[PDB]
Design a protein around this ligand. Structure first.
Ligand SMILES: *[C@@H]1O[C@H](CO)[C@@H](O)[C@H](O[C@@H]2O[C@@H](C)[C@@H](O)[C@@H](O)[C@@H]2O)[C@H]1NC(C)=O
Length: 316
């Protein structure tokens, strides 16, 4: 089953308690949060909703201290494990050692991951709670054709031991993946149906592999890059994917409804490189978030604030 990201950065959202109810009501069995919000954590008790618990980028430095990590795991994980189904801990989100926004944080990521995993393991929860980190694909330097997928050379020192770490504890890699932003940036070379899963014929030939949609192309490029960096047995969890209903080029209700309905159907199976297994996917995001910048970042909601679905999606 597909999951949905619960961002809370709006001034008009239902109270936490109602959002959980609305998850249960809609039969959404997986949730991703971006910080260990106590109210949300308390509201998920007995919910049977599988959780991605996020470590905020702002707390990464602090958690490179083992004792600090131990207490974080105690307060935000062990304090709720009776009643909250932790599935992954996302230590950091979209960190890159070469992007201006997060470069000064790259140092902190693996140590935080190690301390958190150690604490989790000390509590004996390591076969239940998988420690990982959530990337964006700015780290992928080349992705066309997908078989040529490779990480940017200037991030290998960062990525290599993290890949290695994930292998030793059998964690997946978490990836935020948005065919929308790719398309919006280059509508000249990328066709809308390709981005929307509506292409009847193959669009890209990669030897014996036919790519019908941008998502498959993009994911498989990631897999190829992992393979070149000795992470060829890692599973990828798609930890965000969404299409905005307004606010910018190609951000439309119709595009939105198509992408998300087709995505939900697509991920029951895999990609041309890994065709069998379902792709675990977290849709971004539950509600529009009117406090975010820029404009387009206010329209990824699946639901209006009156709790009515934009698109009438079946999550079962
Ligand atoms: C919520 O989603 C899951 C899939 O992730 C469905 O299996 C649920 O259906 C219920 O559980 C299955 C095992 C079967 O018993 C079916 O009869 C149930 O409806 C789904 N829940 C609902 C209420 O649709």
């Amino acid at each position: 089953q597909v999951g949905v990201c619960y961002g809370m950065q709006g001034n008009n959202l239902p109270p936490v308690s109602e959002v959980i109810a609305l998850y249960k009501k809609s039969n959404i069995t997986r949730m991703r949060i971006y910080d260990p919000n106590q109210a949300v954590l308390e509201a998920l008790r007995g919910s049977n909703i599988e959780l991605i618990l996020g470590v905020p980028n702002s707390d990464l430095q602090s958690l490179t201290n083992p004792s600090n990590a131990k207490s974080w795991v105690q307060k935000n994980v062990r304090g709720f494990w009776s009643s909250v189904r932790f599935r992954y801990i996302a230590v950091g989100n979209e960190i890159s050692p070469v992007n201006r926004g997060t470069a000064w944080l790259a140092q902190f990521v693996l140590p935080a991951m190690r301390n958190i995993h150690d604490a989790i393991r000390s509590a004996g929860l390591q076969d239940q709670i998988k420690v990982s980190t959530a990337i964006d694909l700015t780290l992928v330097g080349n992705s066309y054709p997908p078989s040529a997928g490779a990480f940017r050379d200037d991030v290998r020192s960062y990525l290599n031991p993290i890949i290695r770490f994930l292998s030793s504890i059998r964690s997946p890699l978490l990836a935020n993946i948005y065919p929308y932003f790719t398309y919006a940036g280059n509508p000249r070379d990328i066709s809308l149906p390709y981005a929307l899963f509506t292409s009847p014929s193959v669009v890209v030939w990669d030897g014996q592999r036919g790519y019908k949609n941008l998502f498959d192309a993009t994911l498989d490029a990631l897999y190829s890059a992992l393979e070149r960096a000795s992470g060829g047995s890692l599973e990828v969890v798609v930890s965000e994917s969404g299409w905005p209903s307004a606010g910018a080029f190609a951000a439309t209700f119709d595009n939105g409804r198509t992408y998300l309905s087709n995505l939900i159907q697509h991920v029951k199976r895999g990609t041309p490189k890994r065709p069998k297994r379902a792709i675990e996917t977290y849709l971004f995001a539950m509600f529009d978030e009117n406090k975010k910048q820029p404009e387009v970042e206010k329209h990824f909601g699946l639901f209006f604030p009156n709790k009515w679905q934009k698109y009438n999606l079946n999550f079962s």
